[PDB]
Structure 1
Amino acid sequence: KLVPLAYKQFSPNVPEKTLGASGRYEGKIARSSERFKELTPNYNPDIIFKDEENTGADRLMTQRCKDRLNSLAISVMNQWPGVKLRVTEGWDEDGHHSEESLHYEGRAVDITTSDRDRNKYGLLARLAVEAGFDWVYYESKAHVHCSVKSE
């Protein structure tokens, strides 16, 4: 039933920031922006946040992103007992991506399984699609990129 995504594959099969997918970039959200109130914390106890920058900024995302992320968290545990959803990257303030990255406004996450078993990433990407993320992309061997439309 669930066919894993192939490496470098994305779904839907169109560029990310286009209509049928995640839609267009709506501008960066810096801490000091009024847009900041669009972000909302995700405190899901069953999602691992890498939190590499130590700020917990990884947890701040749109309500839409949060909701897709949470459901994925539940199907991940369903697909593999012992394994959870993991986020390596979410809201980015340091421009570590392209121009107009959805990461810049809390509409994108980079995910893995909690066990970091790259063997799982293809199937994970698929679950993310099932979870209703609006664009899912097996970006690299080490993580999967998921994004959503704006509200």
Structure 2
Amino acid sequence: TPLAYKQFIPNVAEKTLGASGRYEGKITRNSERFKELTPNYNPDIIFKDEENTGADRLMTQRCKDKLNALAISVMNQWPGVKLRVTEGWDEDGHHSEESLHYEGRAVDITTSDRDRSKYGMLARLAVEAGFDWVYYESKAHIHCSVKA
């Protein structure tokens, strides 16, 4: 079943043990933890990259794994449509303190066509792809995160 605006699955807070677990600290560009992050170059994912830095591609191995599975299910669901990432790992700083975006453990996503009528189902597909927490965060995107 599709999620609706403001709904999350599992229906518990993101940082709970059963969901994505605790924040571990912001990962900055000059840091040692930054080396755990490698760019996702999957040709079936669109990365917004408004930053012109490639930051949105950077994410943990687990985040990659679930994101790549979702890329397949999106194309299966709606032929001609692809998964789009608006935010991956972030250094711009507009996310809340303790945001999993600062650790490469969260992505904001849309469909390639920006058809908001598809977002509830996109959220369901992210749950089925194995994201540890999926949140219809905004009318404009779905937020998906993973455990450390």
Query: Equivalents in 2 of 1:81, 1:74: separation in Å?
Result: 11
The residue matched to 1:15 in structure 2 has which SS? coil
Q: Deviations over 1:42-81 (max 9, x none)?
A: 0000100000111011001000000100000000000000
Give 1:94 deviation, angstroms: 2.1
Q: Secondary structure at the match of 1:88?
A: strand
Decide which of 103, 106, 130 is 2:104's aligned counterpart.
106
What does residue 53 of structure 2 align with? 55
Give distance in 2, aligned partners of 1:59 and 1:65: 11
Distance 2:60 2:127 in 1: 18
- Deviation track 1:77-119 (CA, whole Å, cap 9, x = no partner) reads 0000010000011111122111110000100000000000000
Instruction: Give the Cα–Cα distance (whole angstroms) in 2 for the partners of residues 38 and 101 of structure 1.
Output: 18
Identical pairs, percent: 93
What root-mean-square deviation, in Å, do the aligned CA atoms of Structure 1 and Structure 2 show?
A: 0.5
Distance in 1, matches of 2:13 and 2:97, equals 14
Aligned to 2:123, the other structure's residue is in SS state helix
Shift of 1:19: 0.2
Cα distance in 1 for partners of 2:24, 2:35 equals 14
Structure 2, unpaired ranges of 5+: none
Distance 1:113 1:18 in 2: 28
- Equivalent position SS for 1:4: coil
How far apart in 1 are the matches of 2:92 and 2:119?
A: 26
Distance 1:113 1:142 in 2: 10
Instruction: Please identify runs of 4+ aligned residues in structure 1 that moved more than 4 A.
Output: none
- What count of residue pairs does the alignment treat as equivalent? 148
TM-score (norm 2): 0.99
Alpha-carbon shift at residue 41 of structure 1 (Å): 1.1
Q: Distance in 2 between matches of 1:40 and 1:148?
A: 16
List gaps (5 residues or longer) in structure 1. none
The aligned counterpart of 1:133 is 131
